[PDB]
Design a protein. Structure first.
Length: 225
């Protein structure tokens, strides 16, 4: 277990973003899906140049799941996944070149009143919008060149620890959200299914949502796109 603090710029960008979308929280799910999407492309492309790319988990899916009892929301993809170093640099710092660009474009557009929603998605920095509805955000990730790890933060800091459960993902990443009190509605299946459906009609991968039929009840992944 090792704790860290966010780069300054990432603290600023976290706020802009939480500010930009303050009245359209639902967008946090749009992004979490996009990211997943991107992650799955990453590996697919990689499967072109490597015969063992999918050896860890032969699937390429995105699977949402609500846990009302424990107040949790999960969004797992069998994408490329992240190594320990990337969890710390990609989430805790301004690693890319296009991220700095977004910090500038965002402040210039936000000042002249122009639409920003598109900016966040444009530069894929949408991950931080998860703090709009979550008190705690946890990212479990297994990548082919490392072991499984856990990242967790309440935005005031973050920490990374190797996952004591061992490689349970195969390959991929799980974004676990500890929902705020005012977001307990995102735990309702019907609410989640419409939002997932609404933001995945452009994903090149199948997106499932652990659902119930129903007293006899049957639970199973339901294809949404």
């Amino acid at each position: 277990s090792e704790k860290f603090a966010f780069q300054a710029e990432v603290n600023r960008m976290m706020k802009l973003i939480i500010n930009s979308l303050y009245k359209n929280k639902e967008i946090f799910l749009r992004e979490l899906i996009s990211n997943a999407s991107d992650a799955l492309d990453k590996i697919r492309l990689i499967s072109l140049t490597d015969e063992n790319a999918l050896a860890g988990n032969e699937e390429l899916t995105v699977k949402i799941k609500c846990d009302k009892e424990k107040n949790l929301l999960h969004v797992t993809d069998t994408g490329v996944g992240m190594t320990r170093e990337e969890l710390v640099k990609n989430l805790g710092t301004i690693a890319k070149s296009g991220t700095s660009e977004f910090l500038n474009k965002m402040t210039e557009a936000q000042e002249d009143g122009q639409s920003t929603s598109e900016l966040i998605g444009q530069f894929g920095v949408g991950f931080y919008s998860a703090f709009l509805v979550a008190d705690k955000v946890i990212v479990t990730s297994k990548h082919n060149n490392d072991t499984q790890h856990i990242w967790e933060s309440d935005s005031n800091e973050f920490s990374v620890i190797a996952d004591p459960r061992g490689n349970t993902l195969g390959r991929g990443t799980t974004i676990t959200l500890v929902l705020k009190e005012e977001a307990s509605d995102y735990l309702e299946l019907d609410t989640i299914k419409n939002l997932v459906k609404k933001y995945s009609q452009f994903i090149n991968f199948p997106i499932y949502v652990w659902s119930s039929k129903t007293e006899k009840t049957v639970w199973d992944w339901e294809l949404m796109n």
